[PDB]
Paper text:
A set of ubiquitylation pathways conjugate ubiquitin moieties on target proteins, which are then recognized and degraded by the 2.5-MDa 26S proteasome holoenzyme. The proteasome is composed of a 28-subunit barrel-shaped core particle (CP) and two 19-subunit regulatory particles (RP)5–8 capped at both sides of the CP. Substrate entry into this chamber for degradation is controlled by the axial channel in the center of a heptameric α-ring, also called the CP gate, positioned on each side of the CP. The globular domains of a substrate are mechanically unfolded by a heterohexameric ring-like subcomplex in the base consisting of six distinct subunits, Rpt1−6, which belong to the ATPases-associated-with-diverse-cellular-activities (AAA) family.
The other three conformations, SD1, SD2, and SD3, all featuring an open CP gate, were refined to nominal resolutions of 4.2, 4.3, and 4.9 Å, respectively. The potential nucleotide densities in Rpt2 and Rpt6 appear to be very weak, suggesting either a partial occupancy or disordered nucleotide configuration within these nucleotide-binding sites. In line with the observations of disordered nucleotide densities, the Rpt2 and Rpt6 densities in the SD1 map, the Rpt2 density in the SD2 map, and the Rpt6 density in the SD3 map were of lower quality at slightly lower local resolutions than the other Rpt subunits in the same map, indicating that their conformations are destabilized, potentially due to nucleotide release. Similar to our SD1 state, a recent study on the yeast proteasome in complex with ADP-aluminum fluoride (AlFx) showed that the apo-like states in Rpt2 and Rpt6 allow the ATPase to adopt a different conformation when the CP gate is still closed. Although the AAA-ATPase module in the SD1 state was in a conformation with its nucleotide-binding configuration quite different from that in SA, the pore-loop pairing architecture in SD1 resembles the one in SA. In the SD1 state, the amino (N)-terminal proteasome-cyclosome-initiation factor (PCI) domain of the lid subunit Rpn6 directly contacted the CP subunit α2. The constrictions narrowed by the pore loops are substantially reconfigured in the SD2 and SD3 structures, so that the AAA channel is widened overall relative to that in the SD1 state. Given the similarity of pore-loop architecture between SA and SD1, we speculate that the SD1 state likely represents the conformation in which the holoenzyme prepares to accept an incoming substrate via the pore loops, and that conformational change from SD1 to either SD2 or SD3 might be manifestation of the preferred movement of the pore loops to engage an incoming substrate.
Residue numbers in the entry:
A (entry chain B): 330 to 440
B (entry chain G): 6 to 244
C (entry chain D): 365 to 418
D (entry chain P): 2 to 205
E (entry chain M): 5 to 244
F (entry chain I): 4 to 251
G (entry chain J): 2 to 240
H (entry chain H): 5 to 234
Write the structure that this text describes.
Amino acid sequence: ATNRIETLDPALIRPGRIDRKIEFPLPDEKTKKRIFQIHTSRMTLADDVTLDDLIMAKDDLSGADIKAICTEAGLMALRERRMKVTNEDFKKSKENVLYKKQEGTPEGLYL
Amino acid sequence: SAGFDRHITIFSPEGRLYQVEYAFKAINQGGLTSVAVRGKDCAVIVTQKKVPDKLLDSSTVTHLFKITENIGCVMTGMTADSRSQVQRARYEAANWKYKYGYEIPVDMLCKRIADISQVYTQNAEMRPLGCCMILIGIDEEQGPQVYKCDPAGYYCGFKATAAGVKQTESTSFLEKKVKKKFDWTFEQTVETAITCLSTVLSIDFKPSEIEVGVVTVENPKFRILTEAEIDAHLVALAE
Amino acid sequence: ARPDKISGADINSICQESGMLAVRENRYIVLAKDFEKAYKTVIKKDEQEHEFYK
Amino acid sequence: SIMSYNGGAVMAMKGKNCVAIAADRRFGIQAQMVTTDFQKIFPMGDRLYIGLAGLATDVQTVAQRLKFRLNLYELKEGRQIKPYTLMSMVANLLYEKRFGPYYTEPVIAGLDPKTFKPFICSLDLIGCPMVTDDFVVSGTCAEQMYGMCESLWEPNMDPDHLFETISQAMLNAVDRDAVSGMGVIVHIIEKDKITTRTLKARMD
Amino acid sequence: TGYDLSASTFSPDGRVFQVEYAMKAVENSSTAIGIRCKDGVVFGVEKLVLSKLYEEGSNKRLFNVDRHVGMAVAGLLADARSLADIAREEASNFRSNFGYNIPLKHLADRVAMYVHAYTLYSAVRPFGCSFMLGSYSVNDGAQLYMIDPSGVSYGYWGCAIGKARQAAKTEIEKLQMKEMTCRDIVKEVAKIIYIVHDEVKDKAFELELSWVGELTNGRHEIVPKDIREEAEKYAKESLK
Amino acid sequence: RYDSRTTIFSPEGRLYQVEYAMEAIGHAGTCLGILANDGVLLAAERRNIHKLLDEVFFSEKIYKLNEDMACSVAGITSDANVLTNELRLIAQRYLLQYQEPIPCEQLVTALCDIKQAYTQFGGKRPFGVSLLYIGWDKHYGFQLYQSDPSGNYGGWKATCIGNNSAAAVSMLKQDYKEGEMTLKSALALAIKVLNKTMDVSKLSAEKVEIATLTRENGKTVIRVLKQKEVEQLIKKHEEEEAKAEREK
Amino acid sequence: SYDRAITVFSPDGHLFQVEYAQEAVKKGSTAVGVRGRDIVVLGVEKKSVAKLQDERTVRKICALDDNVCMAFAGLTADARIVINRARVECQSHRLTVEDPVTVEYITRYIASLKQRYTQSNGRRPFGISALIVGFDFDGTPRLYQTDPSGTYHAWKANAIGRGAKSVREFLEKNYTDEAIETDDLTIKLVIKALLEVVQSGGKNIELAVMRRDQSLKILNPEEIEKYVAEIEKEKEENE
Amino acid sequence: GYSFSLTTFSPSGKLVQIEYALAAVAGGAPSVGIKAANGVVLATEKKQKSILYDERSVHKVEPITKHIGLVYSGMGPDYRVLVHRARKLAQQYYLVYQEPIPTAQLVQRVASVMQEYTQSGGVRPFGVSLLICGWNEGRPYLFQSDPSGAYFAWKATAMGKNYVNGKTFLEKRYNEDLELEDAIHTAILTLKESFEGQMTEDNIEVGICNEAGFRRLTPTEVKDYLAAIA
Amino acid sequence: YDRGVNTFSPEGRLFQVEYAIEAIKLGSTAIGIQTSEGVCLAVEKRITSPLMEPSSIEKIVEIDAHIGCAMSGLIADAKTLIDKARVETQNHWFTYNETMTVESVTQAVSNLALQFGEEDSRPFGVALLFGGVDEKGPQLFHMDPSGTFVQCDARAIGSASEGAQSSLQEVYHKSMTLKEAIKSSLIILKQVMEEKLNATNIELATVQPGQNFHMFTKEELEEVIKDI
Amino acid sequence: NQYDNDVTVWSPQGRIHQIEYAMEAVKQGSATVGLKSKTHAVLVALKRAQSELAAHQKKILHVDNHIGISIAGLTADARLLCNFMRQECLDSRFVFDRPLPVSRLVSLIGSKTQIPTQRYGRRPYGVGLLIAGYDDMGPHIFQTCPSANYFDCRAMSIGARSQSARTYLERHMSEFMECNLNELVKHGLRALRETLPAEQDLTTKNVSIGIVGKDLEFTIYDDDDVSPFLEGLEERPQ
């Protein structure tokens, strides 16, 4: 399992050694909701949000995004000593997770 | 230290640069000894030759180079840098004579040669002329002068003067020698030059090895001595 | 006045070179030429030294 | 002449503690005038004027060039300019066109920046400065203004008599002049204030 | 060493390895000697045929720059051709600007400055040549010069440039050079070239002899070596 | 890794020297300009406040550039002289060509192009200097601009310098003003910003510098104001600190 | 073979900085552009108003002539220089042959300048990719795009910046034959592109139009709210 | 092994081939300059290496015009080049304006020259820091520049070895209001504080700047003054 | 190592030219066949998007009224070379009132196909096929980035050129006819391409001595496709 | 090995390896043989191809009415020196209104090629010229090198595996001088048929022959006046 693929030996990606190379792209904006479903399947939460609000926010998607959103929402929940996590925790968690980290680089560049 | 491998002319940490102070011993690859003496209204140069060969000539080996009719000089270090610096000095003295209408003083030429070496030092991408030049000259209202020109571009000028290979010892002897306030009636100067080189080298040798360059305020023409009068002075100092 | 680059262990060795050279002089008297030979022997590259750019 | 293509007349006269500069208003081709509001006196900083007479193209181009170098000098150095500095600058600007000359006769009139010391000078078309104490004149008509100013000038002059003297001199010399006329502007400045008057001239 | 790359840098002991590497490059080249007499200068070059592919009269290292000045080069050949062209150009300029023949010392100094300037900068290399300059004049006599790859140019009576640089001047100096005319010095140079390296490392060599002096009335040219045939009838007597 | 020159890119595509020029900006003097109609201000922090100077220049960061424009500056100080002489020359060329004062935006873009030509070309040092802009025109009135070493320029109303001014920008957002053109209010706001952001205990007036630019009847004068009104501004702001401790 | 420099190839036949300079565009702001039959329209996303300054200076859509319209991606400074050059090129072309400037000639100019700028010695290539929209020959709508290599490449719709594959993929599923004109459907097409944008914040949308004969018209953030309202109405009618 | 050379910044800091040039400047000969109420006094520390050298040949205190003194702390061969530049440039000003150039304008143009030489990337910068002074428009001035192209204005400052100690003494001993002679006294004091003790009429070299003009003093008046001045 | 155009190899060679020959390979294929009836020529477009307008991508351009071309590699080096040829042809007609023959065209292009030099820039990354009719009948001409120009009777370039040349030498002889060579070429095209052959994939360019004008086939190429 | 990169750098043994690498780049060209009689100079080269359908790359190209060259090595430098060669011909043809002596022309070639072997920024020219001409003293066969040490010979051969050709020249350089044109040309191809492996035969389409005579203008031939020259041969002694 690798992050990058370009700096690797062509003698080691040839078959005989490795027969099933497997792409992991960031798959789709639909199974974002499945990861939000699974990573909130065992935590009490209100309705109060749409995952489409967290689909039309950022263009690259990962479980590293959504689990960070969940954990930061829990931090904002114990920050405000509530349960049944509301929308404002998701919004501040959204902004603080997209900033930390995905921006690149100090302005500007590009913009 | 280095560290930076001192390839081009940049500043190394604390705080020096190494190219020019490697060029300070480009003189020391010469294998030669040069002595200048200014005591009174004459001025004396002395420098040996290194001729092992009988197939090699004797007239073309002289490092006493007449710059102008009232300015001579002497060279050490490697010969090509020396001869190039000599033609540059000749050309710039001629430019002085063309532009300003009179004979150049010996100091201004040293300033110009130092400026040329600094410009070759300031800008990179040219080898900075590893040869040392010693000048002498007579000026009106000032008597005689001796100057020294560095490859570093630091000209200076003073009474008892020496550069080459073995001149830490020569400057030590001239510190011990020019401290007594005697007059210098030109055979005193010849005797001190011959004996100071004859104590640094300790050879006490034939009149065929050293060349003697003199200039005097009775004839301001630069003058190269002959074998007979060099022998005359040598046996005159022989006691 | 000659820099720099003398270590503390070198002084006594310079003095020994001077003194044993005076032993070769067969005299108990310490002249300057003893220090000349001592400087030329126990210094021990490099040296020129300087007076450019201060 | 080439100097007599658009006409022109500039008079400056040094008073007691003040200085006055005046010029004509007419602009036009050789005999055909165009307008009566052509500026030939240009403010160069405070309490320091310049007068230009001759070819109007060189007048405007030299005025803008001097404004250029003047603003660069006063913004490199926060102090204002002394009049001798202006005179050397103008002489340099003219002498750069030694063989390609502009066709003008600049007249500088200004006061001292520290004291109230008056100042007059005038230059040639190649940059020859000339400081006097009584008056300087330029333009197409010369001898008229020379005769009038040598006729009516006194050394120590209150600003009223200075004003009336330069008034009568300009009016009579312009009325004798043919190619320059059609009204007179007068600038009288001093340490306290700057006065600008326009005279009722013969519009013939 | 390392520290040997560019021609503008110095060494930590203070010399230029580019100059040194350019010097000992000519050491591998063919042997070329020279010696003057009391009224002329004689050149002579040990020149080699490769195997059987030459023509005996091609690419002769005995050049002829001026009416009375010619070269006896050794080292890289094309670099010597270029330097010969610069010498021809300089002699032409002196003839143009002064109206008489170039004195050899001034010519040698100008060429030495040209060599030195090509040692100075870093974009160019030092030359890979070492050559001779001979001349004759009725008001100046014979002058024989010598130019290293660095630019140190001064005079001799005799020289050698090649492998046997020491091994030629070992016995050049036992020649009684002053009292002899150059016609004797012809077969002298013949025996000097012939003694060194008869057959040892290589197979065959070939002799050229350039020739300037009082006998040619100021001309510089190759001898008619075939005329009077001085080498081989003496070479067969010099093997014993 | 992919360092050596300003040109060409590092493979992201990101840049090396623009980022390092901003990190060269951050360790320099702090300046600001404020939201104001009928006038505009500049503030500056005195570097090198050692007692053996002369202060006979009257201006260390401020440069009254054409007539109606000044510029603060921050960064490598000699490059600021290099750019300011050229910028005065650009403005004076514009005045030579048109006999109209320069309307400041094409002036800003011209200087940005001067900096940008050294960003693309190689191998040259780009100007590690950001600098401010105040000015007046015939088309928009009082203006504020932020030059950058990238060649990007920002039209601001409350500006930003580096690490010593990120907290200043935070206070400018949290204490944002709009509608009040009263200059003394913005001067008290700037005094509060330099009181918190500079580490100067009790804000000595020798460590500060204030320049303003007002529109007077045709002239658009630039006021490099003196020290005594700064002193009473300090006393006014400390009386406001006493008003702040009235809640105790 | 390496990421330096621009001049040498890869061992498998590539240019690294040509391939790498497109990544600066690919991490840049998104700007789309379509052609109608009569009215052409485009827009950028990510206005990103930071609450305390003006944004009339950050306008990424401009014009060189009254007939051509601009957009770009990547970094802004290269776009500034290229457009400032292209205005003078358009006006120099107008100083020549008296036609309104064709979109094809000015795209050949910009891409050609960009390429011969790239080929030279150590000049950092302009990491932008422009969108050049015009309708000149009897109102024939044309839009070309550029490349950091400098290849003009004619499209019918376009999407660049962040996530351009998805945004272009929406136009694959949107762009049927009967788009225009039907100007209202081209309007709703731009609105659906802005709704299909990577963030689609609703107020950060900035779009500009051209009816092939008029001038550039900047719209108003109340008309676009009505467009989002009727698009949500169409989504509800899909239910 | 970086910076190297003059074309790039550091990863975060400043320019190493300026910092090392300043280091070579700080490794230079000591000097001091004091701006008094009526004049400005410059003085150096000039020890010959041997007793062979001559003290009428090379001159540290150097006039640029008849009213402008200028000394340095650094490397002479570069010092002469930039001085000759300042000479020609001041003469160009006197050609244009026919008026003696003000010292602030000299500092502007000399600073522009030095900053141009610090521009990338083929030459090194100077190993020279300057001390420029003169009595222009009554008020005298004192302007210190540096190899980075910047400049300052001091009441009193020093450059060379132990300049921090000389600066603490000038902070302690000197003040705002003195005369020319009192400035001469405290200048010789702060020079003798850090020099070697064998100080004669020749080891120092002093130039002053009256309102009557620049003046480069002689060893006669030096040995008249410095013969146990305190 | 090999690091630059100013350094040989210990065995040969450039080692920049080699990487240019390697940079031939990335392009789309093209096939021209010389027939004495006239020169036929073909190319693949490799269209990515339906938004990608197919008639906008140029592969066959027109240098002269009887001279075609085809490009293979970097587009813009090819555009520069086409620009220079378009200039130079017109100068030859200018100074001689006649048509520059295609071999002389190729000598003029290959004069600075290698004039690459950055001091005293890089070598170009495109191989070009030239088809035309001089006085000696039709001519088909094949050059390279290295300027080593030679005539070819039926040359194939670019990606999958090996089996293209193989099956080409399988089918070729000297006395071919026109439409037979056309269908023989497009067979090899649809053997080396990955997409279904249709009106948008390929384009033909046919020059004849009696049909000098219009070295192109537009949508009759559909009819040529449907005959297989 | 870090010193074996550039032309300017002297080796620590003094041998510029850039020159020898240029020599080895020359050695990968085609075979060619040049040889003269007292009256007729003939140079014969070998053609090669990219493919079977492709044409053969020509080697012998025309220069002037009495000068023609062979070539081996690079092609861009070949046409560059061709343009320079034609220019140097027609310049003196314009000025002096005479045909050139060959020796000063090839000295001009050496002086042309010296500067790209000494300064930095241009590589030495991989070049394989064999030059045949007629001055007042008859035919000359010169050869070149990337080191600009031009050689005069009577019979040479350069390119790949040209050593057997050189030995053939060794064993017939006595015989070349007296014969007329026909058997001289078939001696030339009895060097070229040993520049090949013996499992194939020299055909028509692979060879070209250029004759210039003391009364005959320089002319290149290909298959058509060469099929007359290709008869009059025996097989190789297998």
